[PDB]
RNA sequence: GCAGUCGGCAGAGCGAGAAAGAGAGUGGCGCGGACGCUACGCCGCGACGAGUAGGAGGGCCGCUGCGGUGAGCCUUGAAGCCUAGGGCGCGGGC
RNA sequence: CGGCGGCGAUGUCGGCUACCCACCCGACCCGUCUUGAAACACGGACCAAGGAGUCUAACACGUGCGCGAGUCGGGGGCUACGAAAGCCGCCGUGGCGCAAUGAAGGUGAAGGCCGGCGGCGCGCCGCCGGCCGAGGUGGGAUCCCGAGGCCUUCCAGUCCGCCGAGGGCGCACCACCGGCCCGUCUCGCCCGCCGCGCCGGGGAGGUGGAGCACGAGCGCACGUGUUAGGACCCGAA
RNA sequence: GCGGGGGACCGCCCCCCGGCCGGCGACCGGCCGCCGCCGGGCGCAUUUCCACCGCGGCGGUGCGCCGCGACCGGCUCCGG
RNA sequence: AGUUCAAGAGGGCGUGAAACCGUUAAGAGGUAAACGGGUGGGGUCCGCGCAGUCCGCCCGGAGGAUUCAACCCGGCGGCGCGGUCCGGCCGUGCCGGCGGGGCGGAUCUCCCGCUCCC
RNA sequence: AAGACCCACUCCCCGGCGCCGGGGGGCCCAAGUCCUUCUGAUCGAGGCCCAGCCCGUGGACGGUGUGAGGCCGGUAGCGGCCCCCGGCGCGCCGGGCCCGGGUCUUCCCGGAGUCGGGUUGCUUGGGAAUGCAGCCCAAAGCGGGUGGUAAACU
């Protein structure tokens, strides 16, 4: 925690270095998708096979 | 740029969304409260926005906040801002062509004589 | 020739980035087992033994 | 990586991407910048206007440190000092204006591009632009010449 | 998370076999031995495994526990089932369905119990 | 992420000591296998003795 | 032949450059050998500092660098004279000497004199015969507390006279910096020709009476 | 198109010519239910398919050597080579 | 198909392919230069092994990664693999970027409103104060508001979700119009003082510029293209 | 007067607390409840579980090889 | 005949390809051979083919098994904050301070050294 | 540099000599040929309990009838021993050297067929001549050289 730092504190044993930043913070895509907020905004799924 | 684009009338309490980098601008004296979603925010821009009382979101948080992007202002950086576009256009050496040429160095003996002065033959 | 560019300089921020990412991955049990280390009985994966 | 190069997909094709009619010969057109006034003249005039000819005075022994004058604009003028320097000057009421020596930070001349924030300042430089000094006077402030 | 670990190991795991236009995962709790996100037995918080018992009779079922995810010593709970075939499938189906424990692996585990039990019944 | 658990520090005989170190934040860094492989493919060329 | 829009390049590869190519495969070997020579020197001059003698404060010339101070070759003879150090004992007690350097100003002279008097205050001088101390040699306490110094001896730093926030006066608010620069350039450009014109029109107008 | 495998915490819909809600409140026994989803995956419709020079993509095509990996193979027989044997792949090849 | 038949253990069943043979139709020998090759154009008797777009540098553009108005330690230094990796920040010297223009001397990137005063004859032509303040027009992905409405006996009656006439703010970008900076030209009136000068500054209108007009660069890697190098390989007199 | 030391301020960080709030699904314990599984008892055979048999039915898949028929549907070429 | 695991390694000898040649076997043969498409015939082997498939449920038939359900004990696991059960830990959360510290700052201001001055 | 006036220590080095505490070379230093088994040969395969065969600061490598941490040489180790050659300290004899800083006064001081000029030729980024050389001219001393445009004045 002093070699590379936390996010609140920089690296004590490096000159100017902080921990890299997450481009997304919650990576649980399944937990994101089946959460209620997205599901109320989704349209109805079209699950039916219309073959020739 | 993000300050002035959310500054427009009717864009209050509303989230700035960019699918690129939010970089700092040091010729900015006052930073108002901004709710921002971006791919990357530069470290000083994070400090300025968070010390301004704002929120920085990422896109997975944006999806849980607004699943259809309601209350959003989608923004872009200047897509002609790179220096390649000053070289792009009409060929320099044709009339009324304000295109930067490719020079190894700039100076009085670097691409200034023949096609660029009326005295040295001709001027375009 | 000898003067082929044998050596590659990597940016210092990226070298610390890769050290950060490899350390972060060395604490998730799926990734080290997918590396093939036999850890199915270690008592905790960031396996810290005391300083003796 | 030689394995991502185009030469791996060109194995089995006779002319190696250089044509059967006009081949890959040695130097068809001269070496380097040959014919820049004769047969490459259209390219040289269309893309490099002013390449040929001789303009302006010679200066035989040029010392580039002599004309060294790195400039700064007024929009980055407060970036030379810290943030508490600006906010303490903002909150105090005695009119005690901070000094920005741009020679100290590494610039010799002040040009005036941006808007300058409404509070007094004393700016020291070796040279000033007219628009820079009139903007510092307009915001309230002083321009101090140093050497 | 699990999707991130999957995006790491989906092509660069040691359990990956890519031969003869097929793909298999030799992971210990991978029902169907399939390199998939769903059937991967390492990246999930909740995993089911089914394999033969230590002695040659019976089917042991493996459930991943909720707390010690980073603690592989106490993580998996093993239960040997030495019953008849219908009772063994009833036990596995009740462990998966009544617990609601990762319920899309129900008949992958049921069919694996059936395959191990058939492999344990001797040939003439 | 931001949640940092309490790693148990183990002893000579392998059982868990009473000690606890909170998890360093470098273990919550973005795990970027493309960047790690880029850093690996460029730093591993740096020990190469020349041949000609 | 040139293609479309691109730079005109002049590569200096028209000579037989491949004989005189200097690869750097002995770079970590040179670094490791220079390091061992440095530690061998530091071990040889065992209480004397490893980097070398003390170097004075010099102002760089040639306006790009004249705000910056740095380490010069040696203290000049008038600096040693004002510090009261003989110019031959200076190099024996560890002072760099530059005979060639003039002084043109008092302040750099005095700053390096005070540097010399700050260095002789720190100098722990071992006696020349080890079982018999002499008149000016250091005492046995600082002999036993002598160490080998690393880095430059009292390293040279840029000091900045930081100015507090002042109330701006009306004289500084009325001073016209750009106008004074333009008039300064005009007066410097026109000093000789105006003097010639004044002298000519002064001496030739005496023809009215002579 | 598919994260909707939304299951005794159940109710299994969304091809149907016509903008939108199978919305919610309040006054007037027997313990069951195929497959799927390497999301760089899988599925469905429709149209199309000449090719020199040339360009681009995919190669679970091939050689050598290095870094990881396969608790890999191997003197109960490796590489190589031969083969009227068995095959796979549009093919490179295996 | 919730229809059937026949043949089987030492002579038969199947094996599209795989070896040989038979027959019908098709079928001139490849590579190359060429408008045109099977050519009475050249190279090739046969087989094995070797055998030709590489590397370095520079530049351009595209793409990937990191950081980002900065970026970069490459040179130096400190502490088996390891000649690696880690560190240095008062090692960012320096490079490129953040500013251009002029031959150069040089100069160097918004302004308007209000209070006070035919000097002239800034009603016009400067400075004292305060305030507001970085342009506009058209198009413009997205987004915002909502006249009304999306049934289950029927009137209400609320909340949520959805749709929506119309009206908005308008990203990037394009086109146009203004604006600002340097060169140069034309016209014309002023303003300054330590030295009032062959001084210094300003305005209006055009016009030349590789500019500004709220950044986008740097480093690394990959790919193509153009070069300088033996430069895809072999070849002179 | 210089340079340096001391102090204050400001910002950030770390640690004690006092209080809300969030998470424990990258990160838990204790008891209580409901469930499921494992083991050991009691239960004792119109239950359960094994293995065989019928040319058994039901539903799926295929017949060893060589064949034929039937109707359904699609595209066609004709004819009355 | 002998050595050797092996002369199927015999002193230019490990492996021993192709071109080319000898012999054996089989097939063929007047439009030089060779090839593409389509069959047919004969061989070489292969399928260790040659009375041909099991799987799930139910019915019947005899057989075997100390065997099912339900209740008791113990262990393990999963899951309303059990509205507001008890306690911890963590926060890219915040507020409070009779708080106790590090770092930084171009934010301000008692002692020492040093330089002129009697 | 010398004189006068003050201030201030008697220790540097040579030639010999004896005494005290890095370099070459030589010789060495852990532990399986344990029990079965494959084989032409094993260094392969299995096993070695309650010390999970033994050593491991040694699991580099090579050799030995495939494949070896433990068979051998080696490897590791601030591991050992014996010579040799230094370097480094103290001590003795002889010899040398019998030495300075400050203040004031009085004296003194410089490299020529060289610089420099012209011309020629070569060279350089050096452009009315950067350097060199030949030839011709040919110095001065408050002088000379340089101060990247030839020349005069300052
Ligand atoms: Mg082609
Ligand atoms: Mg050709
Ligand atoms: Mg090509
Ligand atoms: Mg051509
Ligand atoms: Mg042609
Ligand atoms: Mg070429
Ligand atoms: Mg011509
Ligand atoms: Mg071309
Ligand atoms: Mg040194
Ligand atoms: Mg085609
Ligand atoms: Mg024919
Ligand atoms: Mg040809
Ligand atoms: Mg012809
Ligand atoms: Mg032909
Ligand atoms: Mg003919
Ligand atoms: Mg020919
Ligand atoms: Mg021939
Ligand atoms: Mg070959
Ligand atoms: Mg790029
Ligand atoms: Mg090495
Ligand atoms: Mg190009
Ligand atoms: Mg060649
Ligand atoms: Mg080339
Ligand atoms: Mg030749
Ligand atoms: Mg043999
Ligand atoms: Mg042999
Ligand atoms: Mg042989
Ligand atoms: Mg015959
Ligand atoms: Mg063994
Ligand atoms: Mg060995
Ligand atoms: Mg061996
Ligand atoms: Mg062993
Ligand atoms: Mg041994
Ligand atoms: Mg040994
Ligand atoms: Mg040794
Ligand atoms: Mg020359
Ligand atoms: Mg002069
Ligand atoms: Mg001159």
């Amino acid at each position: 925690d002093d070699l590379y730092g936390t996010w609140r504190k920089a690296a004590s044993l490096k000159s100017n270095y902080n921990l890299p930043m997450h481009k997304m913070l919650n990576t649980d895509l399944s937990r994101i998708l089946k959460s209620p907020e997205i599901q109320r905004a989704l349209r109805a799924p079209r699950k039916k096979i219309h073959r020739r | 740029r993000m300050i002035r684009k959310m500054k427009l009338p009717g864009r209050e309490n509303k989230t700035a969304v960019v699918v690129g980098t939010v970089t700092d601008d040091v010729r900015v004296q006052e930073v108002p409260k901004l709710k921002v979603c971006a791919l990357r925010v530069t470290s000083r821009a994070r400090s300025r926005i968070l010390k301004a009382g704002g929120k920085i979101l990422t896109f997975d948080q944006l999806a849980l906040d607004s699943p259809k992007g309601r209350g959003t202002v989608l923004l872009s950086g200047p897509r002609k801002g790179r220096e390649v576009y000053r070289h792009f256009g009409k060929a320099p050496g044709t009339p009324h062509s304000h295109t930067k040429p490719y020079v190894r160095s700039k100076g009085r003996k670097f691409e200034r004589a023949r096609g660029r002065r009326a005295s040295r033959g001709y001027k375009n | 020739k000898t003067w082929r560019r044998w050596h590659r300089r990597v940016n210092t921020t990226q070298k610390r980035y890769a050290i950060c990412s490899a350390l972060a991955a060395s604490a998730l049990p799926a990734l080290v087992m997918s590396k093939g280390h036999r850890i199915e009985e270690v008592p905790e994966l960031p396996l810290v033994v005391e300083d003796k | 990586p030689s394995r991502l190069r185009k030469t791996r997909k060109l194995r089995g094709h006779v002319s190696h991407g250089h044509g059967r009619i006009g081949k890959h010969r040695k130097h068809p057109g001269g070496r380097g910048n040959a014919g820049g006034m004769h047969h490459h003249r259209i390219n040289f005039d269309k893309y490099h206007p002013g390449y040929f000819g001789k303009v302006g005075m010679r200066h035989y022994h040029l010392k580039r440190n002599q004309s060294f004058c790195p400039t700064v604009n007024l929009d980055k003028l407060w970036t030379l000092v810290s943030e508490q320097t600006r906010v303490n000057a903002a909150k105090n009421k005695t009119g005690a204006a901070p000094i920005i020596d741009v020679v100290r930070s590494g610039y010799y001349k002040v040009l005036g591009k941006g808007k300058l924030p409404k509070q007094p300042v004393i700016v020291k430089a070796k040279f000033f632009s007219r628009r820079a000094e009139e903007k510092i006077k307009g915001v309230g402030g002083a321009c101090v010449l140093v050497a | 998370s699990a999707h991130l670990q999957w995006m790491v190991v989906r092509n660069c795991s040691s359990f990956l076999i890519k031969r003869n236009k097929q793909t298999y995962s030799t992971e210990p709790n991978n029902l169907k031995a399939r390199n998939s996100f769903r059937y991967n037995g390492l990246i999930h918080r909740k995993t089911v495994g089914v394999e033969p018992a230590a002695d040659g009779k019976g089917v042991v079922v493996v459930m991943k526990r909720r707390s010690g995810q980073r603690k592989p010593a106490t993580s998996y709970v093993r239960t040997t089932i030495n019953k008849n075939a219908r009772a063994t499938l009833s036990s596995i189906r009740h462990m998966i369905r009544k617990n609601k424990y990762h319920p899309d692996l129900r008949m992958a585990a049921i069919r694996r119990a059936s395959a191990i039990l058939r492999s344990q019944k001797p040939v003439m | 992420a931001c949640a940092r658990p309490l790693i148990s520090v183990y002893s000579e005989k392998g059982e868990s000591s009473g000690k606890n170190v909170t998890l360093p934040a470098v273990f919550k860094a973005p795990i970027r296998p493309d960047i790690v492989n880029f850093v690996h493919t460029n730093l591993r060329k740096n020990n190469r003795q020349p041949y000609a | 032949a040139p293609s479309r829009n691109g730079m005109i390049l002049k590569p200096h590869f028209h000579k037989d450059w491949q004989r005189r190519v200097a690869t750097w495969f002995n770079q970590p070997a040179r670094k490791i050998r220079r390091r061992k020579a440095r530690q061998a020197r530091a071990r040889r001059i065992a209480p004397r500092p490893a980097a070398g003698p003390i170097r004075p404060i010099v102002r760089c010339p040639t306006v790009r660098y004249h705000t910056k101070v740095r380490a010069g070759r040696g203290f000049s003879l008038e600096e040693l004279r004002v510090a009261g150090i003989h110019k031959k004992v200076a190099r024996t007690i560890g002072i760099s000497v530059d005979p060639r350097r003039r002084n043109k100003s008092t302040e750099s002279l005095q700053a390096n004199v005070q540097r010399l008097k700050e260095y002789r205050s720190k100098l722990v001088l071992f006696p020349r015969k080890p079982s018999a101390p002499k008149k000016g040699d250091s005492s046995a306490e600082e002999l036993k507390l002598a160490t080998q110094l690393t880095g430059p001896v009292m390293p040279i730093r840029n000091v900045f006279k930081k100015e507090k926030a002042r109330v701006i006066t009306e004289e500084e608010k009325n001073f016209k910096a750009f106008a004074s620069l333009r008039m300064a350039r005009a007066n410097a450009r026109l000093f000789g020709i105006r003097a010639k014109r004044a002298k000519e029109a002064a001496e030739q107008d005496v023809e009215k009476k002579k």
Side-chain angles (χ1 to χ4, degrees):
Chain A
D1 266 337
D2 296 337
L3 281 163
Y4 304 103
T6 65
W7 292 273
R8 311 166 53 85
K9 164 60 176 55
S12 159
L13 269 66
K14 295 192 190 304
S15 173
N16 203 13
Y17 185 70
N18 189 359
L19 282 184
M21 186 65 204
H22 283 267
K23 264 182 271 213
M24 71 204 277
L25 272 295
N26 187 22
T27 58
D28 202 357
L29 165 73
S30 299
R31 199 54 209 79
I32 285 171
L33 289 188
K34 74 162 47 69
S35 79
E37 298 89 4
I38 285 170
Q39 292 291 348
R40 294 322 93 62
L42 295 175
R43 58 152 171 85
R46 298 194 264 264
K47 268 148 60 146
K48 262 67 65 182
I49 317 291
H50 308 113
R51 299 166 218 275
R52 191 212 301 211
Chain B
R1 211 188 256 278
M2 210 193 56
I3 290 313
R4 203 167 307 109
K5 294 307 165 209
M6 321 295 297
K7 206 186 300 269
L8 306 174
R11 315 185 154 198
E12 64 273 9
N13 60 56
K14 183 175 174 66
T15 187
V17 181
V18 72
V19 184
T21 311
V22 174
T23 61
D24 183 21
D25 196 15
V26 308
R27 58 186 177 181
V28 177
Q29 284 80 333
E30 282 271 277
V31 178
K33 164 185 200 162
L34 294 172
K35 186 163 305 157
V36 190
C37 174
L39 273 176
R40 292 206 319 125
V41 194
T42 63
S43 296
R44 264 202 304 192
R46 304 191 73 95
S47 75
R48 285 181 93 207
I49 292 162
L50 287 182
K51 93 161 184 295
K55 312 189 179 106
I56 290 186
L57 296 173
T58 42
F59 272 98
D60 62 357
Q61 317 176 8
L62 167 60
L64 301 153
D65 291 331
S66 63
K68 300 182 281 230
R70 294 167 88 265
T72 53
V73 180
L74 203 52
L75 299 171
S76 177
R79 218 173 297 207
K80 302 298 188 73
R82 314 155 58 219
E83 58 196 349
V84 293
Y85 290 95
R86 315 258 200 87
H87 294 281
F88 297 160
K90 325 175 189 279
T94 75
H96 213 77
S97 158
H98 314 304
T99 296
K100 180 180 283 185
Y102 291 110
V103 298
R104 52 184 208 170
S105 303
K106 74 182 292 181
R108 73 153 186 96
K109 35 182 162 303
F110 301 108
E111 184 177 0
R112 314 273 314 267
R114 204 170 161 269
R116 293 196 166 273
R117 327 194 70 91
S119 81
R120 324 300 290 200
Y122 65 92
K123 185 183 70 66
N124 274 307
Chain C
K1 303 294 163 93
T2 61
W3 58 82
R4 174 201 316 241
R5 201 166 54 103
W6 307 97
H7 296 74
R8 253 62 163 176
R9 59 183 304 263
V10 190
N11 286 8
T12 297
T13 301
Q14 312 206 71
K15 294 193 291 198
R16 293 141 190 210
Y17 197 100
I19 279 162
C20 285
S21 162
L23 286 181
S26 86
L28 285 178
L31 305 187
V32 291
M33 292 180 183
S34 309
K35 193 98 189 51
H37 295 271
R38 307 290 322 255
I39 60 154
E40 311 86 320
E41 182 36 50
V42 299
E44 192 145 344
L45 185 60
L47 185 47
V48 190
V49 64
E50 81 191 14
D51 218 342
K52 179 172 280 185
Chain D
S2 58
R3 62 184 189 280
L4 315 175
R5 253 60 159 150
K6 191 183 170 186
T7 185
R8 311 306 313 155
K9 308 297 187 61
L10 283 157
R11 286 277 183 248
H13 313 257
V14 178
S15 283
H16 210 277
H18 288 300
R20 308 183 167 267
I21 307 169
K23 313 180 173 71
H24 194 190
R25 290 280 159 86
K26 300 298 291 181
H27 293 270
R31 284 208 209 212
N33 310 290
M37 183 179 72
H38 290 265
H39 67 277
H40 299 146
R41 187 196 273 235
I42 288 160
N43 179 270
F44 266 81
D45 291 331
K46 193 206 198 176
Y47 295 116
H48 306 117
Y51 178 70
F52 298 103
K54 172 201 296 187
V55 163
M57 294 183 286
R58 284 171 295 172
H59 200 220
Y60 286 151
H61 177 48
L62 177 83
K63 276 149 295 188
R64 293 261 161 61
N65 305 297
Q66 273 213 288
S67 87
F68 178 79
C69 194
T71 46
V72 69
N73 290 296
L74 288 175
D75 62 358
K76 311 231 192 173
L77 186 65
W78 282 95
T79 65
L80 309 182
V81 304
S82 54
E83 199 78 16
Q84 82 181 0
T85 303
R86 206 180 83 227
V87 300
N88 296 14
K91 65 177 51 55
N92 62 245
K93 66 182 181 294
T94 62
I99 302 188
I100 301 148
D101 196 343
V102 307
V103 176
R104 164 156 182 197
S105 85
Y107 306 99
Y108 276 11
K109 187 179 178 156
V110 186
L111 305 161
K113 190 178 154 177
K115 61 169 58 152
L116 201 58
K118 290 323 213 177
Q119 64 153 271
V121 71
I122 302 173
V123 188
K124 306 191 180 313
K126 290 175 136 218
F127 315 102
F128 281 94
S129 179
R130 179 184 72 79
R131 282 162 206 78
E133 52 76 20
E134 81 195 349
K135 283 184 190 156
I136 285 146
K137 301 285 197 50
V139 68
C143 294
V144 175
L145 291 176
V146 293
Chain E
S1 86
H3 284 272
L4 193 85
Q5 309 168 267
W6 171 244
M7 290 309 288
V8 179
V9 300
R10 53 159 292 276
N11 210 32
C12 198
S13 179
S14 68
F15 307 116
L16 183 63
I17 305 182
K18 297 210 290 172
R19 271 190 304 231
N20 298 108
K21 282 80 179 151
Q22 306 158 56
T23 299
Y24 298 93
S25 179
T26 74
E27 192 285 307
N29 294 304
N30 196 307
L31 309 169
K32 281 188 206 148
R34 159 168 318 154
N35 172 55
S36 86
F37 174 76
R38 165 170 271 114
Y39 291 94
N40 194 304
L42 290 183
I43 68 181
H44 292 258
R45 292 132 196 90
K46 299 305 151 263
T47 311
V48 189
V50 159
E51 70 258 26
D55 62 306
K57 264 303 151 183
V59 175
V60 64
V61 58
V62 177
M63 293 131 289
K64 188 170 194 175
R65 85 163 58 236
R66 185 194 70 264
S67 57
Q69 301 268 337
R70 78 198 176 310
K71 303 161 164 320
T74 178
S75 184
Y76 293 105
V77 171
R78 304 141 201 290
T79 311
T80 303
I81 302 180
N82 200 331
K83 318 203 59 160
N84 56 81
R86 254 198 279 269
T88 300
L89 301 175
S90 179
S91 289
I92 290 188
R93 193 182 294 111
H94 289 175
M95 265 184 259
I96 286 183
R97 193 199 288 276
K98 299 295 293 292
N99 280 358
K100 284 74 61 183
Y101 183 78
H102 200 187
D104 55 349
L105 292 186
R106 169 182 32 101
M107 267 196 281
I110 286 301
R111 286 179 144 108
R112 193 157 181 104
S114 296
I116 297 311
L117 282 178
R118 193 267 319 146
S119 168
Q120 285 176 345
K121 264 76 180 179
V123 176
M124 297 300 168
Chain F
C2 62
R4 274 162 73 203
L6 268 70
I7 282 294
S8 178
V9 173
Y10 287 84
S11 53
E12 178 148 69
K13 299 288 96 177
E15 70 274 333
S16 178
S17 77
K19 286 175 134 294
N20 276 323
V21 182
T22 180
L23 182 76
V26 70
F27 286 132
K28 295 303 177 99
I31 301 157
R32 295 281 301 279
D34 52 298
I35 296 170
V36 172
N37 188 245
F38 174 75
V39 165
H40 191 97
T41 183
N42 296 279
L43 292 199
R44 204 172 66 76
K45 296 160 166 182
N46 291 334
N47 49 60
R48 299 198 285 159
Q49 292 182 32
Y51 56 85
Chain G
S3 189
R4 328 161 176 81
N5 204 358
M7 220 166 268
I8 295 297
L9 306 164
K10 295 282 191 33
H12 293 81
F13 291 138
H14 300 262
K15 292 186 219 219
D16 185 74
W17 60 275
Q18 283 182 173
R19 303 200 330 121
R20 311 155 310 260
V21 175
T23 64
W24 282 55
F25 298 126
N26 61 316
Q27 191 205 309
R30 179 201 314 281
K31 285 167 61 55
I32 205 77
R33 166 172 42 140
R34 273 179 180 168
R35 180 176 169 86
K36 312 331 161 194
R38 212 176 288 114
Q39 324 171 297
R41 214 173 151 192
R43 215 179 292 111
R44 153 163 70 89
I45 46 177
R48 305 173 201 89
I54 180 167
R55 309 279 176 176
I57 308 165
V58 297
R59 287 251 165 212
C60 304
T62 301
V63 295
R64 181 168 169 188
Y65 302 114
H66 73 289
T67 313
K68 196 194 81 94
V69 299
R70 67 157 210 286
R73 172 181 187 85
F75 287 92
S76 67
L77 311 164
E78 68 274 15
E79 285 164 357
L80 298 160
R81 205 212 73 73
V82 179
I85 298 171
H86 195 35
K87 72 201 219 181
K88 287 273 159 161
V89 311
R91 288 197 200 93
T92 71
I93 65 167
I95 299 158
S96 296
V97 182
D98 191 12
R100 281 183 297 269
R101 189 175 73 203
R102 90 193 70 77
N103 292 114
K104 266 186 190 129
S105 88
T106 62
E107 311 86 329
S108 66
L109 181 43
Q110 287 305 125
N112 280 317
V113 159
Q114 202 57 95
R115 191 150 211 270
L116 281 170
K117 298 186 290 191
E118 203 272 359
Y119 170 79
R120 196 91 202 250
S121 305
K122 288 166 164 161
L123 201 172
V124 170
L125 172 43
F126 280 70
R128 42 190 301 272
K129 180 68 174 67
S131 307
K134 311 295 171 105
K135 275 70 56 169
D137 311 344
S138 282
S139 69
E141 300 87 341
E142 43 194 359
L143 298 179
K144 86 195 173 68
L145 296 180
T147 186
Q148 184 169 58
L149 182 141
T150 61
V153 194
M154 191 45 257
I156 289 176
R157 294 149 39 91
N158 296 294
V159 63
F160 284 103
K161 262 276 202 168
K162 208 262 181 176
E163 311 79 0
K164 43 189 291 303
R166 323 149 50 191
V167 182
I168 315 182
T169 68
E170 82 289 356
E171 190 94 341
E172 292 196 340
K173 281 193 199 225
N174 290 319
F175 171 70
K176 302 144 152 53
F178 180 74
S180 285
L181 293 156
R182 291 304 297 168
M183 293 177 71
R185 283 180 195 277
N187 285 128
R189 194 192 44 241
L190 301 153
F191 184 70
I193 186 55
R194 276 206 210 91
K196 191 182 85 96
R197 256 195 280 286
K199 183 257 288 181
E200 278 164 316
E203 183 178 1
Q204 197 262 331
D205 206 11
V206 179
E207 184 266 330
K208 194 258 186 188
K209 302 151 297 294
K210 83 189 287 286

